[PDB]
């Protein structure tokens, strides 16, 4: 669903960037942050797609996949993220196993919902 879209984009865009952002504070506006980040990526590449997760004690934890055909300027990722964030950026290799493991990792706090 999200995953079918993630697989489709992973294997149709040159670059799939997996960005993890952590802060040690919770103040700030994750809507505004993600929106303005998405707008930056949109201006970078109008065909790009962005998949984002906010994980919800002390700080924020965001995971972002950026699918794009133009290499990212990593310094701008930081400029469009909260001040003093801990940021890691990885290029996800074009393998099914790798993108699925990344997806699984991103959604790990979003599961464990069961109706019987």
Instruction: Please give the residue ranges that form the binding site for a copy of itself (CB under 8 A).
Output: 2, 5-6, 30, 34, 38, 49-57, 107-110, 112-116
Residues, the chain: 116
Minimal distance in Å, beta carbon 20 to a copy of itself?
15
Q: How far is CA 24 from the centre of its chain?
A: 19
Q: Residue 112 and residue 57: Cα distance in Å, rounded? A: 19
Query: What is the DSSP secondary structure assignment for residue 78, as one 8-state letter?
Result: H
Minimal distance in Å, beta carbon 81 to a copy of itself?
16
Q: Residue 57 and residue 65: Cα distance in Å, rounded? A: 23
Minimal distance in Å, beta carbon 88 to a copy of itself?
19
Smaller CB separation from a copy of itself, 70 or 110: 110
Q: Residue 42 and residue 74: Cα distance in Å, rounded? A: 15
Minimal distance in Å, beta carbon 56 to a copy of itself?
5
Smaller CB separation from a copy of itself, 22 or 30: 30
Q: What are phi and psi of 47, to 5 degrees?
A: -90, -5
């Amino acid at each position: 669903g999200d995953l079918k879209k993630v697989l489709n984009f992973h294997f149709s865009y040159i670059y799939t960037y997996f960005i993890t952002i952590t802060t040690n504070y919770k103040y700030g506006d994750t809507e505004k942050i993600f929106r303005k980040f998405r707008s930056y990526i949109y201006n970078h590449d109008k065909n790009s797609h962005v998949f984002s997760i906010k994980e919800t004690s002390n700080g924020l934890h965001y995971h972002i996949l950026v699918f794009t055909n133009k290499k990212l300027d990593y310094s701008r990722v930081h400029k469009h993220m909260p001040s003093h964030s801990d940021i890691r950026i990885e290029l996800v290799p074009k393998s099914i196993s790798d993108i699925k493991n990344v997806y699984k990792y991103m959604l790990k706090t979003k599961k464990d919902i069961k109706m019987s």
